[PDB]
Design a protein around this ligand. Sequence first.
Ligand SMILES: [Zn+2]
Ligand SMILES: [Zn+2]
Ligand SMILES: [Zn+2]
Ligand SMILES: [Zn+2]
Ligand SMILES: [Zn+2]
Ligand SMILES: [Zn+2]
Ligand SMILES: [Zn+2]
Lengths: 225, 214
Amino acid sequence: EVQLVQSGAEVKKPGESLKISCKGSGYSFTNYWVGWVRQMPGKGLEWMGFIDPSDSYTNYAPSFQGQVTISADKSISTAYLQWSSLKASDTAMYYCARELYQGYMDTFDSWGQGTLVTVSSASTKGPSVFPLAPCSRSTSESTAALGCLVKDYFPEPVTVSWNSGALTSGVHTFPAVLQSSGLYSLSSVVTVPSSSLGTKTYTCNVDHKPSNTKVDKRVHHHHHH
Amino acid sequence: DIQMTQSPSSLSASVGDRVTITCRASQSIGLYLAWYQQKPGKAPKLLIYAASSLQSGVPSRFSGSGSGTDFTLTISSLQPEDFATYYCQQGNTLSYTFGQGTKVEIKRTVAAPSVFIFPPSDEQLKSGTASVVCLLNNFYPREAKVQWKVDNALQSGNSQESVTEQDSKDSTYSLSSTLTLSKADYEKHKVYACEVTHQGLSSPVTKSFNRGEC
Ligand SMILES: [Zn+2]
Ligand SMILES: [Zn+2]
Ligand SMILES: [Zn+2]
Ligand SMILES: [Zn+2]
Ligand SMILES: [Zn+2]
Ligand SMILES: [Zn+2]
Ligand SMILES: [Zn+2]
């Protein structure tokens, strides 16, 4: 079957160069054009341009003309997207796609899995983890919320579990926000019986692979400050 | 420079509904419009090409119509696997362009959020910063207004929020908003409050705490 497989996620600093790849298999590579598409965080699809691997002809969207280079090595059925100098604004998911001409138009009938490119001046940093717990006397309903604030890390992602994975029901782990500092922050919360607050312990477990760190935080509210 | 405009930008629908999404081109593209589906984190997939031709393997509940400048994608009898974002794309020229996308979300009954406020931890304060968090749990629809007040003054510019995708069990949203102050500014004030407005609430709900009595 037709497959496009892209190179792995990249985390780069502004000004660095980058070349990402798209390997086609299960079909005759030189027979089909390969297009590239950008998707910025939380945004839609944008056409970047294409290459005809049979003659190396390339064509770019006006916005991308001069900003990036598309190439192909047909001997290894591989297409490439390249930047000589990255900008933070280049942060996005990049897809390659095979073009199949049908109904008298080009269609993108097979897509790569995407390559996530993150460009930032930030440096790798593990999170600090802080408890989210109600004020001592503010729990009046029969269920309470507790959580952990996972702050000031880079790059994404972190993974958060509760009670070593024993607690999954009612957990909401929110999308991270990018702070003005260039570091991410997210919260993870769980709703639990108010009864259990003095009987049961709740601990969040926060893994951050890029920094090789893991932080556990027992959620508590101390009775003096 | 053919601009594609989709409408609506989002809609809520129930399994079994007939859903219609429209796409307008800034100039005629004849029949040369395709439709794509994308789910979060996943690659798009081709559904329809040349306005009305169904892509091999795609369920026949997807249909397309239109020509010139006005096009429609219709999903008859919406299925659970159809909640996703849909993009149109013109291929009249070699300079392809996509519409901005239409997100098809799950309709359910109104549900008011449960609201919680969390003071900053002592360990965070030690480091010089105070994050105050307001949680809105399990609400529907997505539209919600969260306002922070400190000593009864409305805050602006110093909070960020994010929202989960619809819950797999109850199709609700949850939202977290974080107000961030320096420790020195945090210790200047007494009253910390988040006020929540939502269709499910007859009047806004405020949750609050007083520094020194929390
Ligand atoms: Zn070669
Ligand atoms: Zn206590
Ligand atoms: Zn003590
Ligand atoms: Zn503490
Ligand atoms: Zn919840
Ligand atoms: Zn004040
Ligand atoms: Zn206290």
